[PDB]
Structures are given as structure tokens and as C-alpha cells.
Amino acid sequence: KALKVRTSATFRLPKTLKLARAPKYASKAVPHYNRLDSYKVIEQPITSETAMKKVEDGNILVFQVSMKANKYQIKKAVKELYEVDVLKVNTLVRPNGTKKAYVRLTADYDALDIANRIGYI
Amino acid sequence: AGVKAYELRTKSKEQLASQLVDLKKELAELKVQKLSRPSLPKIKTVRKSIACVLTVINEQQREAVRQLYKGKKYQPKDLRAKKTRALRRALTKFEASQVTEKQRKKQIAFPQRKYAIKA
Amino acid sequence: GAYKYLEELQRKKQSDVLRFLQRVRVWEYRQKNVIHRAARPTRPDKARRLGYKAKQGFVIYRVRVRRGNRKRPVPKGATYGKPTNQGVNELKYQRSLRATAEERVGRRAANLRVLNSYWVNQDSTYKYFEVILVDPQHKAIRRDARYNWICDPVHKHREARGLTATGKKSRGINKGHKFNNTKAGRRKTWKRQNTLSLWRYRK
Amino acid sequence: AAQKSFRIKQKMAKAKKQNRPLPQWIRLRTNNTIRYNAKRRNWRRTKMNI
Amino acid sequence: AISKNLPILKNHFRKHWQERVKVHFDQAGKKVSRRNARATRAAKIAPRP
Amino acid sequence: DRNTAAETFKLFNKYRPETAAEKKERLTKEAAAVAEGKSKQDASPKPYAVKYGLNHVVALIENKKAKLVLIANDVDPIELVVFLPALCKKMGVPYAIVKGKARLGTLVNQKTSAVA
RNA sequence: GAUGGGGAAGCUCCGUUUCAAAGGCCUGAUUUUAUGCAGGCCACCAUCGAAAGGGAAUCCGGUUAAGAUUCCGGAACCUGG
RNA sequence: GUUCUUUGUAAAGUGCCUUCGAAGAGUCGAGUUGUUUGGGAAUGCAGCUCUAAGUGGGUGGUAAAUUCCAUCUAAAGCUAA
RNA sequence: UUGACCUCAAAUCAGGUAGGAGUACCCGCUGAACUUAAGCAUAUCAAUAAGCGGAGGAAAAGAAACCAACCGGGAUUGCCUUAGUAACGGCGAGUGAAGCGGCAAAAGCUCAAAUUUGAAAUCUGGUACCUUCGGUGCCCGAGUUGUAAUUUGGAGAGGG
């Protein structure tokens, strides 16, 4: 025969137990593979005369790029594939709906050597 | 023609991944050549080869999951039968054939008989 | 055998005991929400004879419905027609309040099927009904052949189509000379005796 | 405009790629009736309403 | 609208009847279906009559 | 009163019912006795358990076979139980309104019983 | 303009802090503590809504056929860690 | 047409004597309102008010009382062509 | 103090289900006016169109609280007829069924209300196993505020 003592005149939800997920079956069978890997991130170089000029002069590669991709991914893909360190990436969306990346490499690497290694010029 | 799934199904996950990576490399070089030069339709074959390899990989993974959830309740929804919604809904053959005991006794006592009107 | 005593006792409604209970319970249900679940039936005899069984997948909801007529909406009381159709107020809604109740609880719990319903209380503002519902995806009811008919897809929203008892009463479906306009589908019998049937070989 | 949504720009790109005349080789095909591209959409004549 | 010596006719066509005209072109086909149903039923059922 | 109720529940807890464990035990015993003795309804002794259930108990009261009836001061659908004093008086049965359908359930191996 | 609730045969309406048990900030506990537990803190209670209102922080020179306070060079600043 | 299990001191059906024979209420029904119907002193439906019985109740197309008769058995429910 | 019950909650709890489309045909709600009446209000158009809710391959209805007044038939549905009939109707315009009969097709049943009381005999779920569109065992639970067997009116039950 005793009673609780309540200093506030407010009743709130008792913080009862939040029990965690423990499913009997997976939500999907197989994990999806990486949806945006490096070969999906970089599609094609861009070999317009302006882009090749920027290769020769600014040490800048010009790539066609997935619209779902961002600068982090582009940098990661370039470093992964062409074995190249990377400064500033700039990006635009072209008037045709594809993304264009201006990747500036560091001073140690030569974007033209990288380009003729990739095959184009 | 490229690759053949009956040749790929004898391989493992790792060989298939290496094959796929090599194919993606090749596709990239072919994309470069496609713009350096006027036309290159080998890119079609290598694209479909990538497709066949991914198909085989998905198949292997799914049959592994099936053998993991083999013969137990609560399989995944991408692995149950799809049949159609309304069929996945109302009754099964068992539940439909369920019959009360009064009706069972009456059925056994007085089933429909074969009869003929000549004599 | 208690259900018989309960039947007759609930029959004696204007007795002191049951009008005391009327008052207490109408207060209680007025305090609770318009639609709320009843843990148990308040008239187990009535639920029982209407098809309730105390097993898993039978559910009881309680529901208020606002009482009286149907005022025609008609902004500012205007109908824009002939004086036969100028009435706004004294109009009386061919379905019952029991039906409206069934509709509302079925719409709240669409995963269930309405079986039936029964009066429990009333006041001047509200009537109070208890609706019996059945879970058709519960495997007791998918089995239990006496109730597996409810799991056939031709029994979705029986209340909406008028297949409950009050729905058939309102539809006017009983036998006899008194129900000739509505014995098998008012609109269907209208349609057939306004069909011109013409054969290949005629007059 | 010039401070656009991506949704508007996406549609403008499809309209840039749609605004070309026929490939010539399509006139040469077997059972061909397409003589010209009907759905041309010059910016003077007809606005696309986004 | 009333004219020479003729009977008063009561033709009930002041409704949209053209929407509910039924012509039984299906007469002979329904007959065929009915015979086939009888035959199927006999066979499927039994020697029962 | 609490003392009388204590005595009452002692008396009833002597005549508790069966549970599943000892029911399976006596089922084994009877399956054995039907094999060896072949004595049907003669192996296990007569049970002297307490009778529960409302329809059961009402029928017992009507046929005057009940010797003592306990009734809960509980149930909320009170119509279930209001008529029982009148019955026990009409039929000459001693009835007692005790506190706790939960007590009755505890002795009778349920949660609630409402009578005993 | 949701929710809670209430209306409405219903499409939906009201209303946005309400007749709601409408949550989180930290602390210890510590090297069983995962994050529970001994505690104490708070009361308000969605979301949308302004390329002219509020608002963290950049300038110069040069450069293209056509881009630039966005690129090159140089010189700075803010935020977060 | 074949083959394996006989589940079964289980279940069902049939005759005579006797004692019983539970049968659905805010419902039926009535008054009023409105709507509807070929339905006419009110065919059905609905709202409000009143509200039953048990050898009873409904129906028997002119309202009412009295006496009879005939025929069904509501207010719970499933079901092919 | 410890452990129950009742009621009520919360959980990204385990497992499920509802939504929307289509909508010719079907079940309902809601609901006009044009028009006809040589005007027009009742009426008629029409218990229609439009609006809303809800289903299936058909739906609904359905095994009498029926029809009848017969020497009595006997669930429902549909066709031929009854019938432009009885009846309604500013008895004006107009509206307007049903029983019988002939045929197609045919099919019948289930619950509640009963103490099993010498034995909740019933059921979901979880787990282990298996000849796995389900079965057996074991364990929590639901449930006697009544789950199974038995009986539904044509009958039927308890005894002998």
C-alpha cells in the first residue's frame, strides 16, 4: 500500500524496449552488384579539338561520365584505372544530357602520355 | 560470337569475375576506337558477352540461396512463385478440400452411385 | 446453459438493471473513439448466434454513428430543378445506420471481412453497434471449413455491396408478393422488363 | 530561365536530339513509306510548352 | 397527333429502349452449346440418364 | 470475508482439476490397462475435481447436482452472472459471491473462470 | 498542408496545436553495459512556402570561334574534421 | 484397369415403447415523416417515437372489431447450372 | 514485497494483409434536367445520365416467415406467355407488374439456442525431423466470458 511520487503533472510514454529486426527470410535473395563501378563511371573520352588542346596544355583529361556519378567517384575511378593522382575535378551537364568531367592531374603525371596510353589523341 | 553460357556454367565465381573485368576493359578500349574510327560492331558481341556472364553469375547465386532456404518455411519473395496476386491469395488445395466431420460422414454413407436404366 | 437467460434478459431492456447498464456503457463508449476495438463482445449470446466464435481471427469493433436523417448537401438549400425535388431536410437515406457503421469499420480494417453486426446502445446523438469481423488470411479460418467461405474473393466488402443482413433488408430481398419490385435485384428486374426482346422470327 | 531545373534541361536535350532530319538509308529500305520526318520542332514555328 | 378512325395504341417507347434492345441472333448457337453441354454432361457423368 | 474465503479456496485447491502433464500420465496408464486388464473405465479412479464453466455450472444448478457455487464479483458484462443468485435460490443451492475470477482461474488452471 | 481526433453514403471536409501515454539532449555505468541501468535535464509537438526578403566564405590579371567572380597563374577567406 | 495400406472393439443407416423436443428482439409489429412502387385507408425502404409474444408470430392486395380456416416459420448463414 | 488478471499502449518485434488500374457485363448508394403533357407546377422523362463505393469470371438471387384457395403446387435464375392485362394516373398525357401454364437448367445444406463433464476431447504459432502446396513429436500461447464431437425443424435428442 504505497504510491509513486510524480514531480511533473505530465504523463509521457514509458520508454519500453525497442526490439530489433530478426527476419526469417531475407528481403531479397542476392545482393545487387555495385551499380556504379569505375567502368560505369567513365564511359568514353571526349576527343574534340578543344579537349585535346586542354590535354596538351592544362594537363587535363576530358571524360564522358555517367549522370549518376559525382566527383568523388570520378576521382576514385581515374586513380583506379589509369593509376594516376588527381587534383580538381570539374563537371558539367552538357546540352545533350551526358556529363562531362574535366579531370586535372597533378604535375608529376602527363595527361598526354596518359591519353596515348588510353589509345586516343 | 563471344562467350557461351554452357562453357561458363562449368566455372566458378572468381573465374567469372575475372572474365567480366577483362570484358569491361575490352569494351572500354573498343569505345575509344569507336570514336577514333568510323565504325566498330565488335562492341555488340562484347556487350552481350558481359550480359551472358552476369546472367550466369546471378543464376549461380540464386540457386545457392535456394539450396540454403531448401525445404523450410519463409523463402524470399523474389523466390516464391509469382503466379499472380489473386492466386497467391485465396485458398490452397488442402484448405479448399477441408470438410467438416458431419459432411465427411454423410459423404461416406451416401455417395453418388452409378446407376443405369435398362433393367 | 446461460445464453438463454442472457437472451431473455437483454430482451427486457426497459428494466431497471439494463437501463442502468445502458447509461453506464453509453457514457463509456461516448468517451472512447468513434471506431474502436472491443476486446470482448458485450452481448456474447448475440454475437454467437450471428456467427462469432471465440477463436483466433474473429474480431469485434465498436462503432458510433451519428443519428437522424440525411440532409441533402445543396449549397444554401438550392436544388435547381422542380418543386418535387426542392426538399433538403426531411430526407431519409435508403441504407441504415447499421450499414453505415459496417462500411466505416470495413474501410478502417480492409484486411478483414465483415460478417455481421448488432445494436448495443443508443442515445439522441449516436447509435452504437458492434461489428463482427473475420480475418480471412488467418489459417484457423482458412481451415475451419465452416468459415472458409469468407476467404473466397466474392466476399470482399459485403457491407459495401449489401450482402450482410441489414444490407439485404435495405435492398428489399425477401420472397413474396410484397417484394416483387425488389426480389432479385431491383435494377436487374427493371432492366429485363424494360428490355425489348426480339427474336429472329417475329410477328 | 538560365537558372533552371534539371527536369527542364533534361527535356530540352531530348528535343535537341529529336530535331534532326531523317537518316538517308531509311529511304532505301524494303517496304519504306517514311519520306521525311514529320515531327520537326523549330523554335520559331512551334513551342513545346516545356 | 390524333387523326382518323383508328384504335388507341399504347406503345411504351418513351424511354431509352434502344440501349436495352436484345436480339437473339444467338438462338441457334445457344442451341448448339446446349446440345454439346448435354452430351458432355452425359459422357463426363456416367451411364446415368 | 477473507477468512471464510481462505477456507473456501483451501477446500477447492484440494479438489483442483487435472493439468496436461498428469492427463498424459493417466492416458498412458489407461492405454496400458486397456491392453493388460482390458478394463475400460475401470483403471483410473473416479475424479472428484471442481466443476467450472458457466454453461456447465448453470446446467448443474438446474439439475440440482451442485453442492456449492462460487461466483465472481468481477465480470464487466455483468449479465453473464447476475441471474445466478436467483437460480441458486430457486433451486436450493448455496452460492457465494467471492472476489476474484482470477483466484478462480488460478485454482482451476485458467486465467479467468467467473464461476466454480 | 499531413498527423491525432472529429464530420461526411462517399469522392473527401475541418483543423495545425489541438479533448493524443505525440521525445530527445547530455551525464555517469563502464572496460560483462551491446547500450541497458542508478540517476538528473528539459515541453515545445510535422512538412511546404521568397533565383528581388534573411543568409558562412574571393579577388586580381590573363585566356576561347564561342565559357568564365567557375578555366590558368597569383594572392586570400569560411565551414567541417 | 492395377498395386500398398484395413485404419475398425470406429462410423453411418433401418424398426417398436416411453420422456423430451431448446428454434435468432431495439427485432417483428405499430404511429408519424419522407422516398419509392402497378400496389390502390398506405408495395418496399429509411429516419424518429412506441415496442411484443409464445397452443405464438407472419401472410392470405379495402381500413376496423369478433369468430374460424389455410399456409409458411422472420429477425443468423452457405451453394453450381 | 512478489506474482497474477482486466483494460490500454509501444516496438524498423515474427509473419501477413488493404490500398491503385480496368470497369462491357454485376451488387449497391446518390441523383438531375432537357423532353412529353401541344402552356405548366403533380406526373413524365427516370427509380435514367452524370457523381460515389464495391466484385467476379460471371455477379446477384437461392433452398419459403412462398404461391395459393386447386383433386392444391413446392429453392433460385432465365425464355415463351400471362399483358399493354389487374392496377396507378391533373383517372389527363402517360405508366404498369404477379400467381397459374409450357420450356431451358436443376442440388442441396450449415449454425445459435443442449453439462464432453469419468477427464478442451479443439486450434494458431515457434522449433527439430520428414515420403514438405502438408505431416509427426516437443514447447509457449488462444480458449471454458465456451474451442471440438452431436443436433437445425424435412426434424432431432435421451433412455430401453
For the residues of chain C, what is the DSSP string, one character each?
Answer: --HHHHHHHHH-TTSHHHHHHHHHHHHHHHHS-SEEEESS-SSHHHHHHHT--SSTTEEEEEEEEE-S------GGG--SS-GGG---SS---SS-HHHHHHHHHHHH-TTSEEEEEEEEEE-SSEEEEEEEEE-TTSHHHHSSTTTGGGGSGGGTTHHHHT-SHHHHHHHT---SGGGSSSSS-HHHHHHHTT-EEEESS--
Are the CB atoms for A102 and A60 separated by under 8 Å? Answer: yes
Phi first, then psi, for residue C8 (nearest 5°) are -65, -35
Picking from B77, B80, B82 by the largest number of A CB atoms within 10 A of its own CB, the best residue to mutate is B77
The DSSP call for residue D12 is H
Hey, are the CB atoms on C145 and B91 less than 8 Å from each other?
A: no
**Spatial separation of the C-alpha atoms in residues A110 and A61, rounded to whole Å:** 10
Find out whether F107 and F116 touch, Cβ atoms under 8 Å. yes
Bridge partners (DSSP) listed for residue C199:
E24
d(CA B51, CA B8): 12
**Residue that is written with C-alpha cell 520526318 in the block:** D37
Q: Cell numbers 546471378 correspond to what residue?
A: B58
Amino acid at F90: K
Tell me which DSSP letter residue C73 carries.
Answer: -
Question: Are the beta carbons of F62 and F83 closer than 8 angstroms?
Answer: no
Interface residue ranges in chain F relative to chain C, Cβ cutoff 8 Å: 54-55, 58-59, 62, 77-80, 82-83
Q: How far apart are CA A90 and CA A102, in angstroms?
A: 5
Place of cell 485458398: B91
Compute how many other C-beta atoms are within 10 angstroms of the C-beta atom of residue B96.
Answer: 14
For residue A27 the three cell numbers come to 528481403
Beta bridge partners of C198: E23
* Interatomic CA distance for residues C58 and C132, integer angstroms: 7
Grid coordinates belonging to F60? 448443474
HEC letters along chain E: CCCCCCCCCCCCCCCCCCCCEEEECCHHHHHHHHHHHHHHHHHHHCCCC
B117 contacts in E (CB within 8 Å)? 49
C-alpha cell at F61: 444448478
| Burial environment of residue C46 by CB neighbours within 10 A (0 to 12, 13 to 18, 19 or more) | buried
Chain F residues in contact with C41 by the CB 8 A cut-off are 77
Could C196 and E17 be called an inter-chain contact, meaning their C-beta atoms sit closer than 8 Å? yes
Phi, psi of D27 (to 5 degrees): -70, -25
How many Cα atoms sit within 13 Å of D3 on the Cβ side? 0
Residue C19: name the closest of B44, A88, F79, A40 by CA. F79
Query: Which residue of C1, C6, C40 is in closest CB contact with F79?
Result: C6
> What cell was used for F108?
482451476
Give me the amino acid identity at C61. Answer: Y
The packing angle between helices C16-31 and C3-11, to 10°, is: 90
Cβ atoms < 10 Å from Cβ of B95: 16
Q: How far apart are CA C51 and CA C62, in angstroms?
A: 16
User: What residues contact residue F18 under an 8 Å CB cut-off, 6+ apart?
Assistant: F26, F47, F49
Enclosing H/E stretch for C27? helix C16-31
Evaluate whether B38 touches B28 at the Cβ level (below 8 Å).
Answer: no
Q: How far is the alpha carbon of A39 from chain D, nearest alpha carbon, in Å? A: 24
Residue given cell 481451415 in the structure block: C143
d(Cα F37, Cα C185) in Å, to the nearest integer?
Answer: 68
Cell output for C200 = 429472329
The angle subtended at Cα B23 by Cα B17 and Cα B24, nearest 5°, is: 90
Do F54 and F84 meet the contact criterion of CB atoms below 8 Å apart?
Answer: no
Per DSSP, C158 falls in state: H
H-type helices in D1-50, by residue range? 6-18
8 A C-beta contact, residue C198 and residue E22: yes
- Helix or strand holding residue B28 (H, E): helix B13-36
Do the beta carbons of residue F16 and residue F108 sit within 8 Å?
yes
Are A120 and B32 a contacting pair at CB < 8 A?
Answer: yes
Angle made by CA atoms E35, E39, E43, in degrees to the nearest 5: 170
Task: Look up cell 468517451; give the residue.
Answer: C31
Resolution, rounded to a tenth of an Å? 3.1
* Cβ atoms within 10 Å of B51's Cβ, excluding its own: 13
Q: Partners of C66 in the beta sheet?
A: C126
Please tell me which residue of chain B has the smallest CA distance to A43.
B28
Q: Distance between CA atoms of C110 and E36, rounded to whole angstroms?
A: 43
Distance CA F38, CA F33 (A): 6
Q: Please provide the DSSP assignment of A45-92 as one string.
A: E---HHHHHHHHHH-EEEEEE-TT--HHHHHHHHHHHS---EEEEEEE
Residue length of chain D: 50
Query: Count H helices, E strands: chain A?
Result: 4, 4
Q: Protein footprint on strand H: which nucleotides are under 7 Å from a CB? A: 9, 11-13, 22, 24-28, 33-39, 43-49, 51-53, 59-61, 75-79
Give me the amino acid identity at A100: K
β-bridge mates for residue F97, sequence order: F71
Three cell numbers, residue C56: 483466433
B69 exposure class (CB count in 10 Å sphere: 0-12, 13-18, 19+): middle
Residue pair F71/F84 in contact by the 8 Å Cβ criterion? yes
Radius of gyration of chain B (CA): 28
Residues ≥6 apart with Cβ < 8 Å to F62: C1, F87, F91
**CA A105/CA A98 separation, integer angstroms:** 22
Q: State the Rg of chain D over Cα.
A: 15
Q: Shortest CA distance to A63 belongs to which of B31, F92, C142? A: B31
Report the residue from F55, F58, F79 with minimal CB separation from C9.
Answer: F79
Strand H-contacting residues in C 106-145, CB cut-off 7 angstroms: 116, 118-119, 122, 124, 127
Sheet holding A86-93, edge to edge: A42-45, A60-65, A99-105, A86-93
Torsion of CA C41, C46, C48, C50, to 10 degrees: -120
Cell 422470327, residue? C201
Integer angstrom CA distances of residue F8 from F12, F56, F66, F82: 6, 21, 15, 21
Angstrom distance (rounded) from CA C12 to CA F83: 13
- Taking the CA atoms of residue F23, residue F27, residue F28 and residue F33 in that order, the dihedral angle to the nearest 10 degrees is 140
Q: How many Cβ atoms from other residues are within 10 Å of residue B26's Cβ?
A: 16
Three cell numbers written together for C203: 410477328
Neighbours of A41 (CB within 10 A): 23
